[PDB]
Design a protein around this nucleic acid. Structure first.
Ligand SMILES: [Mg+2]
Lengths: 101, 61, 87, 59
RNA sequence: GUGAGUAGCGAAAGACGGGUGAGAAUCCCGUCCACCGAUUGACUAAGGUUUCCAGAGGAAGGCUCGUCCGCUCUGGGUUAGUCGGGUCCUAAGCUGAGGCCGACAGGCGUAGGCGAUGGAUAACAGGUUGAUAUUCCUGUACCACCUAUAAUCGUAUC
RNA sequence: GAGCUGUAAGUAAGCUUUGAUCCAGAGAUUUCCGAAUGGGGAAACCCAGCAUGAGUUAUGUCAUGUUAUCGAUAUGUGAAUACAUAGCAUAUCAGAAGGCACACCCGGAGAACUGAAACAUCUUAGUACCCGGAGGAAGAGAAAGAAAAUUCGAUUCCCUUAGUAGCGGCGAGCGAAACGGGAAGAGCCCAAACCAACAAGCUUGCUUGUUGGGGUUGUAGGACACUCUAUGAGUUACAAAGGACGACAUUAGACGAAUCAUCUGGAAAGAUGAAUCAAAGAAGGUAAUAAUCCUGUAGUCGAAAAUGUUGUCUCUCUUGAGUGGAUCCUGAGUACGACGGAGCACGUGAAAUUCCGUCGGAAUCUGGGAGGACCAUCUCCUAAGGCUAAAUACUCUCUAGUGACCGAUAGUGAACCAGUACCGUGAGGGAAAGGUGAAAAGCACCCCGGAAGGGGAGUGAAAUAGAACCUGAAACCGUGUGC
């Protein structure tokens, strides 16, 4: 449904109305990671070798039914359908009709 | 991979079966005791290329 | 044939007799005779005595459930010609 | 157990009444007589009941 | 919870100087003192199954305390042709090819097997480790088997 | 069709768009103990024999291969005793054993307390235990039957007959069947009389010994006597037993319609507004209560393959009736009777029909049995050989799904790695356990401390949710204060 490399649009969250890209999708818990969306402030272990007494800020994963794949030819995040006469499913946006990648 | 780059010769099965079992996995489990965490992912691969060399000799029966 | 799983390099009783003796951890089920014809068809040396001993499984306990470790047979070769059968 | 070697008759069970109808159990037994019946091989020593001996008594 | 900060603390001689430590009547080292000594001493069977040993621990267990430990974490420890067994033998007993008995299950028993608490059976001193010693290595031995062998004896002999 | 390396958190070293992980079918490996099977044993271990093979100048040591006991076909081979028979030595042999679903079924054996207001015949009960046999079901089964009509036409299971007829220290109590309505519904093979051969008789025998042909019933049917038909008819679930070609079902899987913006909020699925799809408003999750966000549902769609169910195509195999009347046949120690027991609803009672132990013991179609002692005529039926599907009883399991059923002292003993800690020599007994948050963002850094544990600062909607982790009652122990 949603994979890494394509834009999204958060529809339901504290950081809604924000585009971005997918970083890494947890497939079992159905959670995706988008940059700049639901960022943390981790109290890191400053006895680690890397830093000197600080607070990390890495993005936190959101569930896959909070992003929605967009093709703004009519300024709209759409849903996905599947067409194939080529031996492999080419992904189709049903609300506009164009072939996306 | 390895699965059908084998089926090369009948006689060179056992002469490579004894070459990897005896002379590779025995060196790679002595060096694990005296200190090596350099390639501790070669021990899985030179063991799963023995199973492929003792499966093909059943097809030649 | 390979009935020598690992060597063992512990503190004194394994590495403070290294002028002629060496210590392996053999597989079970085997003799002290087969080890004479197993450390000779690898390293090309000539043994003089092989001694074996058996340890029981001993009890470890981690978490909230106890279990036993694995039993092991230990062999101690002693050479006549050549040296340095471990590196 | 014991059977007629010719026919195959054997024991039974059943109660044992009295003059006041108290009932223990008991056992009936076929009248088995040892006799030398000629069969294949040797004429062995077998167990034959005495009702199968009225006609077929071979030596 | 009350009984209550009550009954207990499981025979029995300890005293001091020094260290150690956040903390010591209790742990370690020293001197004096007392107790067993046909045993409270020294080796092996039965039984238990890591407790043994060195380095770190102080929440629980120890009838108090604890720096300590038979308790917790890490890493180690058991070496045999000759000692005790098996590849040798049989007692009481147990099991039993055919066989003999019994509603079925099954009970008894001959040849043969199993079974030491007994018969047979070739190695002893000294040294050493933080934990093993007739096992490891120092010096001298001995019983079984195999291979070369020479003096060889020959219907010798098994 | 892009992330994966069981719990997996944690790092390490890797593999994958030349399709990895994951899912389904089919083959390969499957150490030692176990019916244990070379012998031994205190299961998971110890000792061997004969063949080929490595190794050593040679023994010691290893690998593969086999070797239990009965049975029954065989080949030998001397039997005490000349012939010859029980013994013995071998080749073979998908033959046998044990495990079970403690369920249902059929046989063998088979109690007690209890009810009778005591108790013995009786009831509890042919039940519980135990033992043997199997099956996907098993048992019964093709009228020596029910019955009293111008009778119908195997068995089995439900409804009614009926708590009626009966049996009963006539007490307590036990308790039918046929008729009638239904679920289901097929019937067939031998024995004998006999004809033809081959091993023993001039034998007198087609009968005896073996093997093939014949032949199956009561309206009396077959041997034997006669003609009139001889290709259609099949089953391998009964009645004799041996293959292909694609239809459909099962174990992976794919497609699958339609909602946008504001208010309170840490967050919209909520209320207020406008839109839409609907063979699809069942259900679960997503920062709160979603027909339209996700996984899906109604509906279509899909098999390289391995089983499974049937259609027709082979292929095996097969004679079908009638009339006559002289002769032969139509299951024997059988049926039945007396003595003793069991079972039929029925307790020896006037006791029929049915089986068991013991002795007695028949008739042969003008025969034999039954119709509740028995006898006489009318009436139905053919005993002493065997094999048979379905309707019916169950559930340790696999898949879809329901519930005016439970919600952590409940429902399984068991939602936690349960028949486990632990108790017992042994059979056997047997509990305790669940919840942070939407997301680990699980408390960086300073300070008192030896450390625990604290108090600030910080993450969070809230830590007065900090792993003694949701809400937090009473008992019981505290500190403060008006009378
Ligand atoms: Mg029964």
């Amino acid at each position: 449904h949603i994979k890494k490399g394509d834009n999204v649009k958060v529809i339901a969250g504290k950081d809604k109305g924000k585009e971005g890209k997918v970083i890494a999708t947890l497939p079992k818990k159905d959670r995706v990671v988008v940059e700049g969306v639901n960022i943390m402030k981790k109290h890191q272990k400053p006895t680690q070798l890397n830093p000197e007494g600080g607070i990390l800020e890495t993005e936190a994963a959101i569930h896959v039914s909070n992003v929605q794949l967009l093709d703004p030819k009519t300024n709209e995040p759409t849903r996905v359908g599947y067409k194939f006469v080529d031996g492999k499913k080419v992904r189709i946006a049903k609300k506009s009709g164009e072939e996306i990648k | 991979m390895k699965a059908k780059e084998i089926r090369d010769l009948t006689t060179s099965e056992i002469e490579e079966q004894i070459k990897s079992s005896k002379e590779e996995l025995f060196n790679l489990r002595f060096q694990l005791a005296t200190g090596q965490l350099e390639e501790t992912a070669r021990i899985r691969t030179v063991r799963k290329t023995i199973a492929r060399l003792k499966t093909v000799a059943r097809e030649r029966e | 044939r390979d009935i020598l799983k690992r060597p063992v390099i512990t503190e004194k009783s394994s590495e403070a007799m290294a002028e002629d003796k060496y210590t392996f951890d053999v597989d079970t089920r085997v003799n002290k005779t087969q080890v004479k014809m197993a450390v000779e068809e690898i390293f090309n040396v000539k043994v003089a005595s092989v001694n074996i001993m058996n340890y029981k499984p001993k009890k470890k306990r981690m978490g909230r459930y106890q279990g036993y470790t694995n039993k092991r047979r230990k062999a101690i070769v002693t050479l006549k010609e050549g040296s340095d059968d471990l590196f | 157990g014991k059977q007629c070697f010719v026919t195959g008759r054997k024991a039974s069970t059943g109660n044992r009444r009295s003059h006041a109808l108290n009932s223990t159990k008991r056992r009936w037994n076929a009248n088995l007589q040892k006799v030398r019946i000629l069969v294949d091989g040797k004429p062995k020593k077998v167990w034959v009941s005495a009702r199968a001996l009225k006609s077929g008594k071979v030596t």
